[PDB]
């Protein structure tokens, strides 16, 4: 009598192969950025809900929301016995924000009042240090932004503002093979193996030199580099995994059935939308805006979320996501998006007074990760409901599809998802709908909208800015730059022994407090 599938004693969450050296400012993917949030610890941290709280810093003072003064706690140290100090932060930021190094996350350092000098052009790059970041002594410094940004103190917990040791600025090319940081966990590095197998696994054990907000409550993690999630699901079912972190699409209609309350779910901070790059004919001006409002009126979102996804999405009530702190679901005025064939047909009949129709209507999309189902469904439900002829037109290559739109908005109206980085709504609005702020692939220009966002940022408190953002979002409904489809919902399944998993705010579990017994 008895039995068992006897398992190691750490945790085996599935992961993936991070395609870059393990550097804070050098990664941009949630597949290799989930392994770097366990090694370091910044000036702040976010609990599962998404609220900031001081970890390393001790006092962040700003009486005008333009000048910040940061004083840091004394008693910290890296896993090589090197003292943490303000030099680490200042040097890490000055390194990452430099255009010479060609560093991925450089754009995040745009609001420091010294970024335009070091990332604009090599004509005034004789200085390679920003003029905002001062240093008073080794335990405090001073930042100076451009315009009042009440959202700055929230992004200091982002995975890009992390401190780096002293033995890294000189041999950085090696810091991609054995990183070192003051975080909760740390790379195992036992004689048994290299602690990073290169497409096999990564081990992590708790750092016994940590005193912070994210105390590890297990014995260590082991990220198992997988692919073809169905394999990881089989691995989980046959007692060889502990946290799946995503149920594969081929198994989310029976997962509850053969898991049995060993699977939960919760909203994420990723949305999805479709758009017509306004350079394509018959979509500029009033007629194009009316066509887009019609298309918003002509997609039944609950039906799709129930038929295709089977409940791993959520109908889009606005242009932000659900898990975002300070979300207004029943926003007065949220009616514009709907499934109201009455309004759709009458608006099409009102809008064709400038032109009946031009020709085809294609929807172009990457076709490797899987979009055929919902793309065909939206194409069909958008066709033969308003008297049009839309169809799909896939592009098999990721680089090809990305270059097709970085071709600066040619044709073949396409889909766009914008995963958030740190939990604030302005991070969803501004990087998308602004005069020239990069990803504005719909040609939407509004100085009224830009001024509304500016006034929302220049707020005394956070709830006031929440309300101002709500109103600046209401202003968006009158034009509908993109048409929003649905927010994400993530599913997490654990096996039989781990006991305290939760889905935090971006879909990923709370790895720090999954107690295994």
């Amino acid at each position: 009598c008895g039995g068992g599938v006897l398992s190691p004693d750490v945790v085996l969450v599935n992961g993936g192969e991070p395609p870059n050296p393990l550097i804070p400012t050098g990664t941009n993917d949630s597949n290799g950025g989930r392994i770097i949030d366990r090694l370091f610890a910044g000036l702040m941290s976010y609990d599962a809900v998404g609220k900031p709280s001081l970890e390393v810093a001790q006092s962040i003072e700003s009486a005008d929301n333009v000048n910040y003064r940061i004083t840091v706690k004394p008693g910290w140290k890296f896993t090589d016995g090197s003292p943490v100090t303000a030099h680490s932060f200042v040097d890490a930021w000055n390194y990452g924000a430099l255009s010479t190094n060609a560093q991925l996350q450089q754009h995040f350092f745009s609001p420091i009042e010294g970024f335009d000098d070091v990332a604009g052009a090599p004509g005034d790059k004789s200085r390679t240090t920003m003029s905002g970041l001062r240093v008073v002594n080794d335990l405090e410094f001073t930042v100076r932004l451009k315009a009042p940004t009440i959202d700055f103190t929230l992004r200091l917990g982002h995975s890009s503002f992390y401190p780096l040791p002293d033995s890294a600025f000189r041999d950085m090319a090696a810091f991609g093979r054995n990183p070192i940081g003051n975080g909760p966990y740390k790379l195992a590095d036992g004689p048994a193996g290299p602690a990073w197998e290169h497409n096999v696994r990564i081990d992590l054990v708790p750092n016994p030199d940590y005193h912070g907000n994210r105390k590890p409550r297990n014995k260590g993690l082991r990220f198992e580099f997988y692919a073809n999630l169905d394999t990881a699901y089989a691995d989980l079912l046959s007692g060889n995994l502990d946290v799946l972190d995503t149920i594969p699409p081929s198994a989310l209609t029976v997962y509850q059935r053969d898991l049995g309350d060993h699977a939960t779910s919760g909203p994420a901070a990723i949305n999805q939308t479709l758009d017509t790059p306004l350079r394509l004919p018959h979509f500029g001006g009033e007629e194009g805006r009316l066509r887009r409002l019609a298309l918003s009126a002509a997609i039944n979102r609950p039906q799709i979320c129930q038929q295709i996804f089977a409940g791993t999405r959520s109908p889009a009530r606005d242009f932000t996501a659900r898990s975002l702190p300070g979300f207004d679901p029943n926003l007065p005025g949220n009616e514009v998006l709907d499934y109201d064939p009455q309004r759709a047909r009458r608006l099409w009949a009102q809008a064709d007074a400038i032109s009946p129709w031009s020709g085809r209507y294609a929807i172009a999309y990457n076709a490797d990760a899987g979009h055929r189902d919902w793309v065909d469904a939206v194409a069909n439900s958008i066709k033969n409901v308003l008297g049009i002829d839309a169809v799909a037109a896939p592009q098999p290559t990721f680089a090809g599809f990305r270059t097709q739109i970085t071709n600066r908005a040619i044709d073949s109206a396409f889909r766009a998802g914008w995963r958030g980085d740190y939990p604030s709504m302005i991070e969803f609005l501004a990087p998308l709908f602004t005069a020239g702020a990069g990803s504005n692939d719909v040609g939407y220009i509004n100085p009224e909208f830009d001024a509304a966002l500016a006034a929302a940022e220049a707020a005394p408190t956070l709830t006031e800015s929440h309300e101002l953002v709500n109103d600046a979002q209401r202003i968006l409904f009158h034009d509908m730059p993109v048409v929003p489809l649905w927010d994400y919902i993530s599913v997490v399944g654990w096996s039989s022994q781990v006991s305290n998993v939760t889905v935090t705010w971006n879909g990923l579990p709370d790895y720090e407090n999954i107690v295994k017994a």
Binding site: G3, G4, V5, L6, H198, S238, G239, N240, D258, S496
Partner: protein
């Protein structure tokens, strides 16, 4: 008997040695460099191509490393699994459930097969006889994994009265259906064999001269027919336990039972050889031991071969 065991055991040593040497030859005697094949799927680096050379001793002649392999297997050193744990620990922790499954399979096999075979042999030419013979002939044809998929589908997906995934909740009530699926193949053979045996034995001469001295019908039946008939059934049961060892694999793979068959199905599907050769060696030794015990029982039951 005493001079039969000392001969049934002497005929066992070369079998043991030859089987182990054959298994250890088919590997290490073939593809030039064997460390290439022992790598599974993970990439090979000079830090992995040296952890197993120290555990296999691939630098010296074949005799010494074969001897060391046998000694290591016997001292309780079966290798190191994928997750870093010694394979011996995993086997010692996963044998209870596979025994709990094999017991149900063998119970249905023995009881049902013997009962129906006796009832069909003690009345030949009947409709029941023809029905059971044709049904056994049909049941034999279906492979194990096909029958497992059919049972899984029909009884778990259409009308949920059985668990589709027996994951670490392996009470007998939840292990009943996989056991039946595992044991139907053998139940068919057993019922056919015992039917033929009883039908051909109920006409011997000692049966007639035993019923010719006033013995009752139940007593004649039980003693004189159900001893001489049931001996070959136990011989076949030994052989077919041997053949069922490897049928348990697929029926624990498609039902997600955390047994030794589940361990072996993982290691086989995910291409992990070093933890396959060891488990198979252990299974072969268990098979040989069970065969020897069945031979001793056979000798104890039939006094003619027990002539010394």
């Amino acid at each position: 008997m005493g001079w039969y065991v000392a001969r049934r055991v002497a005929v066992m040593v070369p079998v043991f040695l030859g089987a182990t040497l054959l298994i250890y030859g088919m590997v290490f005697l073939l593809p030039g460099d064997p460390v290439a094949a022992l790598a599974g799927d993970r990439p090979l680096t000079p830090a992995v191509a040296a952890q197993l050379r120290s555990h296999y001793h691939l630098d010296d002649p074949f005799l010494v490393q074969y001897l060391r392999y046998l000694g290591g297997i016997l001292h309780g050193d079966l290798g190191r699994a994928y997750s870093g744990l010694p394979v011996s620990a995993v086997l010692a922790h996963a044998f209870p459930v596979t025994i709990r499954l094999a017991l149900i399979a063998l119970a249905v096999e023995a009881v049902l097969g013997i009962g129906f075979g006796v009832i069909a042999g003690l009345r030949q030419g009947g409709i029941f006889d023809s029905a059971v013979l044709v049904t056994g002939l049909v049941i034999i044809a279906i492979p194990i994994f096909v029958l497992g998929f059919l049972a899984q589908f029909l009884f778990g997906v259409q009308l949920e009265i059985a668990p589709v995934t027996v994951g670490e909740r392996a009470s007998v009530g939840r292990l009943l259906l996989p056991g039946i699926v595992l044991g139907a193949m053998s139940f068919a053979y057993v019922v056919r064999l015992t039917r033929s045996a009883v039908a051909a034995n109920a006409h011997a001469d000692y049966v007639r001269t035993a019923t010719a001295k006033g013995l009752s019908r139940p007593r004649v039946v039980t003693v004189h027919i159900l001893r001489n008939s049931l001996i070959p059934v136990v011989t076949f049961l030994g052989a077919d336990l041997g053949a069922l060892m490897g049928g348990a694999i697929v029926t624990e793979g498609i039902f997600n039972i955390h047994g030794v068959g589940g361990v072996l199905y993982q290691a086989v599907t995910r291409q992990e050889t070093p933890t396959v050769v060891s488990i198979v060696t252990v299974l072969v030794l268990i098979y040989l031991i069970t065969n020897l015990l069945v031979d001793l029982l056979y000798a104890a039951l039939d006094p003619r071969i027990r002539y010394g």
